[PDB]
Ligand binder design. Structure first.
Ligand SMILES: CC(=O)c1nc(NC(=O)C2(N)CCC2)sc1-c1cncc(N)c1
Length: 130
């Protein structure tokens, strides 16, 4: 219905706002663009499912997120990718890992504080009916 399309539009508006707030945070600059396949060639080999904040914005606009859970799966993917590609004790690796986990914790905290539980529940119930 049109009520349901209004629900999803509200979700997209909310997701764009959260994603913008993540993308302007200086700590998260490394997660804002895809990994250049020239700049580092072993990435697309180790990371089978790359994900970044600009790709998150594209998926929002393509209506690929019908629930905040769908969105948080891709946030989780940005983080776990970073942990897996950077597993070493070197300080470069530890810094990215620290930032990846901060990205994840920040997104979950914003959603927990600002997304109404019933709004998300509605999104899920519309999703299950399709
Ligand atoms: C996204 C990611 O996981 C990522 N990880 C990197 N890791 C490192 O450079 C090391 N510490 C381990 C190799 C040294 S670079 C990088 C990245 C690569 N191209 C572009 C952008 N925006 C980030």
């Amino acid at each position: 219905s049109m009520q349901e399309e209004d629900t999803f539009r509200e979700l997209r508006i909310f997701l764009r706002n959260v994603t913008h707030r993540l993308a302007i945070d200086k700590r998260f600059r490394v997660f804002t663009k895809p990994v250049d396949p020239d700049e580092v060639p072993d990435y697309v080999t180790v990371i089978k499912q790359p994900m970044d904040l600009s790709s998150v914005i594209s998926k929002i606009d393509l209506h690929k997120y019908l629930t905040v859970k769908d969105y948080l799966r891709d946030i989780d993917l940005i983080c776990s990718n970073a942990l897996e590609y950077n597993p070493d004790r070197d300080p470069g690796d530890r810094l990215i890992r620290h930032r990846a986990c901060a990205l994840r914790d920040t997104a979950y905290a914003i959603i927990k504080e600002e997304l109404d539980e019933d709004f998300e529940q509605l999104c899920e119930e519309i999703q299950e009916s399709r």
